[PDB]
Amino acid sequence: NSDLDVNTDIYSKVLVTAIYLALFVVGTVGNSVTLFTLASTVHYHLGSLALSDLLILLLAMPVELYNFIWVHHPWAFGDAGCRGYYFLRDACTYATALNVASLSVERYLAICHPFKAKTLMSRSRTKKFISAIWLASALLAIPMLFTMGLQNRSADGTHPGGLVCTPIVDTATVKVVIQVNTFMSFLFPMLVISILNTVIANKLTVMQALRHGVLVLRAVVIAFVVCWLPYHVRRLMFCYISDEQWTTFLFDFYHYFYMLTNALFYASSAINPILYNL
């Protein structure tokens, strides 16, 4: 009966009703405004990032609220629904990270090598690169199609409420898949964004409104450090803590910390349109 039930504070999840709804509204409005306003090469990349953020926010908010915040069990969207959810979520995460990295590279090329950029950049080329990064993001989520699925984890063999969707493989594959996702979504884009934004900021600080521009660059790095570092940490824990290492305090923590981490991750997409538009 209570095999998979966790008694978490109602007010803290009441607070979720307050935070997730607000982020949904704000991010949807920001991304929609950005997309409509956009609709030389900056506009295409900004549209790509805005569409990625809007898609992730809209797609993930209801499923998150239902199967992860309040209706914990049984997973109501079946195995196919769960697989689609996870694939789309991971593809959107990769898409956002790759859009940020590509935009940073574009900025570096435009600013620190203006004469090369004048001839190397073209609308068709940026469209092709955006398509390529979208395809790469879609491909990087293919492995999750096989590493996650439904399972009935009831105490007995069968139970109506003992069904949840989780990774469907042993640690041997969980480690590999989570490490690959962490590298591709955070570490590599983290390094590219940080290095190139720091370099451009240094060049511009060498040199009144220009200061604002520099701030924006720095701000973006902070975002990819702040909004995407905590979330991924949770993933690592889910793989690295063993049954003999888990404890009741850890079990309750993981849930509350999950609330916080997903809040920050959704805030990332809700905020990016504002940071890049202004």
């Binding site: 914990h72 996870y86 984890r153 949840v164 989780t166 079990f251």
Partner: peptide
């Protein structure tokens, strides 16, 4: 006994 939700 560990979380089931990734």
């Amino acid at each position: 006994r560990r979380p089931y939700i990734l």
